[PDB]
Amino acid sequence: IDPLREELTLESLSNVKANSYSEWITQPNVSRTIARELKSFLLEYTDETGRSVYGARIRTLGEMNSESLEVNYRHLAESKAILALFLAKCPEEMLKIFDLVAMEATELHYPDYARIHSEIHVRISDFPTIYSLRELRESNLSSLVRVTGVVTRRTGVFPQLKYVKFNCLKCGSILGPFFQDSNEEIRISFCTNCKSKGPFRVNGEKTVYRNYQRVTLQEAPGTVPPGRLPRHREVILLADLVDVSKPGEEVEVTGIYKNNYDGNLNAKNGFPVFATIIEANSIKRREGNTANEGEEGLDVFSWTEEEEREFRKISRDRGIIDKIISSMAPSIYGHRDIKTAVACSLFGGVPKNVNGKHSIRGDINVLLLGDPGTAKSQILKYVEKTAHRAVFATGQGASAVGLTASVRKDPITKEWTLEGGALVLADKGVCLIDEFDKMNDQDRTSIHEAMEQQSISISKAGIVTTLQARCSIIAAANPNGGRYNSTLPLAQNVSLTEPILSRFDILCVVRDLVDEEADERLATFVVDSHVRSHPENNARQRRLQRQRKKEEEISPIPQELLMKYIHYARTKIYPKLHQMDMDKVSRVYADLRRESISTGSFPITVRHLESILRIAESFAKMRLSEFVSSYDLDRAIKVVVDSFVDAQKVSVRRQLRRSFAIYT
């Protein structure tokens, strides 16, 4: 038997006989044992359900033509503790072996996958320990670390030489290709054959290129101590990792802590100090996901095939829309009109492009004009948590170019450049503007183009460009005087102008009135919620079970399942209108215009007919239906008419409600 082909066992693998972990892993027999154990873990691991998680993951990976297999660290730790320890201590060689064993499990399912992607990368999802850029020390060198920060700066994607080939200047012999480290340059000093002190011209008949990118990771403002300067690190993103993190975002970086010799560093400091970097292994978008940190996986909004089947099963239910509405902010007692609007905005409409000449917005904007203590900021926070991409801004905390896009001079290239804003960051998402009425006029006026054209136009310092802002806006405002005056028209209760008001699809007026029954019910619900949330009131499985039991009381649908459902519906569902009552909608629009002719009333234009259609599309989308039904159109008509009626005065509200009773 060839000794190089013999293998040890797991308990013998635990016992280390080398001077270092890397030397132990690199040994032939140990490497074979590790590869065999990793393959066994990938093939045989089962979850609580009992199905192979990684088999389905590999199937999905092959279906989408991707080159990254996500492996949860906890699964490996429970299944194989020693392998998890090796991965934590020696990420490099362990990751190499893991990558090899993954293209043999992918190839197991798709035999000819090598013709699509040559190699497959393994990405670690949930490293148990999280560090700050301040906490990094020398003891973390050459070991896997998990850090969080802000992407301050970014480079363009460059092709980097995977393998470097050298040829002697003198002799002319061409040395074999050598592995290019991501961190620092590879050079040949001593020639095997020539033995020449002289340098080698670097030449190669054929070279394989690799995607390369570098970012400047900075401590997030939230985590840095107040009033202290942030610390930063340089993160290197290799192939398949490029462009995943965009400047200004908050991310969690899983990578290898590496050091290298820097001459200028030494020169400047006067001590033998080594530069440090991070080799990114995995990136998780933490932006707007502070309250979602309790979940697992690189993306909490992604779904599996079984979850898709569950989504279909849920959608087939008749009362899906009612459950979805009831599940919006379960801790808020009532306001079933502010929950319906929020759900409609979250799901959104279908943008349309007629013959390539006419562009129609497909997003829904909502405005909350109400009393001081009617749970508006909490609703905005919930929307931020649930939405896939959300941005939160305050009244005076937002500038006219902090929203939209701004122009700066690039520190490196000394040239004018373009930066994104709130709107940009909220592309295909939601922008939340609390304290809308306290906004500066200038600031307010900025969003006019963005809210309808879904685009940002910039003409500054020789920069002539148009961006994409396909973001919905939900805003909370306080009526003039600090309290709504139901006697006066809507226009006199707020300082907003006709265009901005017209740009809002749904208006939700919130009134605080003293009523014995309403006060009793609201107080009872608030007290019950406060008692429910008291901190005092397997171990992980037990915690999840008790959390699920607590959630079941107030929400018919799990919150995480709800977020996944919303993301799936937005991504994969585009309803269309083919059968609909033209006369009904036309008459509703005409009646709305006739009733809105009154001075000081809520503005009505074609925008609101389009908003009726958009809300019908959104209601159809809530059921994962490919076609808008008559019921959805009726519901949208009822919503719009109810909002319009509620926006009126006390004196004429009864007459308006009696007149419009047919549609509602």
Binding site: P3, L8, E11, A18, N19, Q27
Partner: protein, 705 residues
């Protein structure tokens, strides 16, 4: 081919290492206990077979490197031995509680595994020697294997406070449990194995820094000479740690028991040489003066004062103003020519001006030094090459333990050990290699000198414990060794014999001081040892000393001093017959230009010597100048320059008796030189040059008449 075979060898030895065994983590008891594998004994036997069939017969050392790479020793053999020793200790405690109580199964198998482990330990710890015929592979792996040996020694002395020493002691006591007649050759082999293990543990030490000389050394030069491994410090492998471990594990008691019953209840053939080697390696690097000296604070204050005086003397050479002050001096020669010097001290002083003039010169005359690597001859580092003054810094408790052990050995079995070794070696003289000669001579010299010093300090313990040195068998053995070493031009054995002879002469002088009537039998020895050939040899030694290392010089000097001392004392006391001894003839024999040259050379290095060496040198000079009236010898310029250096304020401390000797000699020498110069102006010229050898004028030069 070779690289692939190396890879296969490493893989197979790694598999063997992983198959030997390891700790059992299943048990909840912590720290976990070591568990033996299914084929532990077979694995050890296979490892020994690999050692025999690859390391030796094929003249390579790849097996040892492979074994060291995978930590077979520090992780498998030492834990196995320690666990077995602990099991035996528990069994002994149980027997104490109840002799019939037993807690052992497969005792034979455990003993077999322990014995094989000890054998493999001895194999791995055996001294490494590089010869001229050693293969390229052996030459290339010398340093790495020496570093691995250092790691092995550190682990042996540290792990569990060194319980493997107790395991080896138990293995030896197992053999001791059976009578001498009942002792089979296997038992004697086990005893020799244990003694060799102890000798190897003591012997190991850092190697040399070998550098290729093909190319003249670069402009960068030598950075540092470090042979230590990464995580090993000199504190772990020093003799202090060895003494601590031996005292803790009662190794000293076992060795004393073996050496006290030597040649009575044991077979001496197996045990005599290992004991001698053990003791030589014990006492090779130890200076006996240190053993007979808070006091540390007092010595620190004295040393600080000494450094303060040195700095004060240095201060006169430093300018009060900064360097760029820019003072220029012009000094007028006896002829009207002006030389330029820079520095405030130049303006304020003249001697400083001439010293700077000298110092500023760029041209250097080549100095060629004949350096011999000790590793070339296979010898270990010892007093022969160790720099003078190199002191082993013992702790108080460790020093007390070492002194007690040496005293007990000298009072118990030094006589018998010396007798047995001398008999065995004189029976087998020709088969001696250089190492054995140096070892025997150094051991004899060290122990004799230590006993002399202790007798001086303490009136109880006396010369009768080392009286076996006087006996003629040992004396003739030493004389033959030294004479043969001289004749064959083996300078290291020459040096060892020199040291041994110096100690023997000091001993005989003390015995004569003891009692004359009882020392008639030693007058016999004195007559025998001062044979004309021997006289000649002893005289020749100094003449050649100048060519070799400093230590050679010092030994030459000391032996000369002892020879003259005994000669003068025994000529004054009585008459001597070898051929009657004419002390004046010998004296005259001692008076030539090479001797003086040697002396001068030795004295040039006066900043490292003690006061005793200077005292001996100047006693010799007094003999030359006054007693012999051979003054022409000393009318040289090397002596004048060196004496200026000695008497200068920066040279020697004012508060010193050495300076007193130097000042007295300088006064006498200057007086006589002035008288001679007043007589003969020619001597001004003469000073510069070696003596003339002309029948006509030679006498005139030499004696002035």
């Amino acid at each position: 081919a070779a690289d692939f075979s190396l890879t296969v060898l490493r893989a197979r030895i790694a598999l063997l290492a992983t198959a030997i065994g390891g700790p059992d983590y299943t048990s909840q008891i912590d720290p976990p206990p070591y568990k033996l594998g299914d084929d532990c004994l077979a694995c050890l036997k296979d490892l020994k077979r690999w050692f025999k069939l690859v390391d030796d017969q094929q003249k390579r050392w790849d097996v040892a490197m492979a074994v060291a790479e995978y930590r077979i020793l520090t992780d498998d053999l030492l834990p196995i031995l320690i666990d077995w020793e602990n099991k035996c200790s528990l069994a002994a405690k149980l027997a104490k509680n109840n002799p019939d109580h037993e807690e052992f199964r497969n005792k034979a198998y455990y003993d077999k595994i322990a014995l094989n482990c000890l054998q493999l330990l001895v194999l791995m710890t055996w001294p490494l020697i590089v010869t001229e015929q050693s293969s390229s592979n052996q030459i290339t792996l010398y340093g790495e294997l020496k570093k691995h040996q250092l790691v092995y020694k550190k682990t042996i002395l540290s792990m569990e406070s060194g319980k493997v020493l107790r395991a080896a002691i138990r293995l030896a006591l197992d053999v001791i449990k059976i009578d001498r007649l009942s002792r089979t050759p296997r038992d004697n082999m086990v005893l020799k194995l244990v003694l060799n293990f102890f000798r190897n543990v003591i012997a190991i030490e850092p190697g040399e820094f070998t550098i290729n000389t093909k190319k003249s050394m670069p402009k960068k030069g030598i950075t540092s000479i470090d042979t230590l491994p990464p995580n090993v410090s000199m504190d772990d492998i020093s003799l202090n740690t060895v003494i601590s471990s031996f005292h803790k594990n009662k190794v000293f008691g076992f060795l004393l028991t073996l050496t006290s019953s030597l040649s009575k209840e044991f077979d001496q053939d197996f045990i005599n040489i290992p004991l001698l080697e053990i003791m030589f390696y014990f006492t090779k690097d130890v200076n006996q003066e240190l053993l007979f000296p808070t006091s540390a604070g007092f010595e620190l204050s004295k040393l600080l004062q000494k450094e303060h005086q040195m700095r004060k003397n240095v201060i006169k050479h430093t300018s009060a103003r900064h360097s760029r002050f820019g003072g220029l001096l012009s000094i007028q020669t006896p002829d009207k020519t002006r030389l330029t010097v820079s520095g405030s001290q130049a303006l304020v002083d003249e001697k400083i001006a001439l010293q700077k003039l000298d110092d500023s010169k760029k041209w250097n005359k080549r100095i060629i030094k004949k350096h011999q690597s000790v590793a070339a001859e296979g010898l270990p580092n010892s007093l022969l090459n160790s720099q003078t003054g190199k002191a082993i810094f013992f702790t108080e408790s460790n020093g007390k333990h070492f002194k007690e052990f040496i005293n007990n050995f000298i009072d118990s079995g030094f006589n018998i050990l010396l007798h047995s070794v001398t008999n065995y070696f004189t029976t087998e003289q020709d088969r001696m290699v250089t190492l054995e000669q140096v070892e025997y001579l150094l051991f004899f010299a060290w122990f004799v000198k230590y006993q002399l010093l202790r007798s001086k300090i303490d009136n109880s313990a006396d010369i009768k414990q080392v009286s076996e040195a006087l006996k003629e068998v040992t004396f003739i053995l030493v004389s033959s060794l030294l004479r043969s070493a001289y004749d064959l031009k083996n300078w290291t054995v020459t040096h060892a014999g020199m040291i041994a002879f110096n100690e023997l002469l000091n001993l005989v002088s003390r015995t004569k001081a003891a009692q004359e009537e009882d020392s008639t039998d030693i007058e016999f020895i004195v007559s025998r040892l001062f044979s004309d050939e021997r006289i000649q040899l002893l005289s020749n030694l100094p003449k050649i000393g100048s060519k070799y290392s400093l230590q050679f010089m010092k030994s030459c000097i000391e032996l000369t001093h002892s020879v003259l001392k005994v000669l003068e004392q025994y000529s004054d006391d009585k008459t001597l017959v070898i051929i009657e001894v004419n002390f004046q003839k010998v004296q005259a024999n001692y008076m030539t230009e090479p001797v003086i040259e040697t002396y001068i050379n030795f004295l040039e290095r006066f900043r490292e010597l003690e006061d005793d060496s200077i005292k001996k040198v100047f006693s010799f000079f007094h003999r030359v100048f006054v007693q012999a009236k051979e003054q022409a010898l000393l009318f040289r310029f090397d002596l004048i320059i060196l004496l200026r250096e000695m008497l200068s304020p920066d040279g020697l401390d004012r508060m010193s008796r050495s300076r007193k000797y130097v000042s007295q000699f300088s006064d006498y020498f200057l007086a006589r030189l002035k008288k001679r110069l007043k007589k003969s102006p020619a001597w001004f010229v003469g000073l510069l040059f070696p003596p003339l050898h002309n029948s006509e004028v030679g006498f005139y030069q030499r004696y002035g008449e």
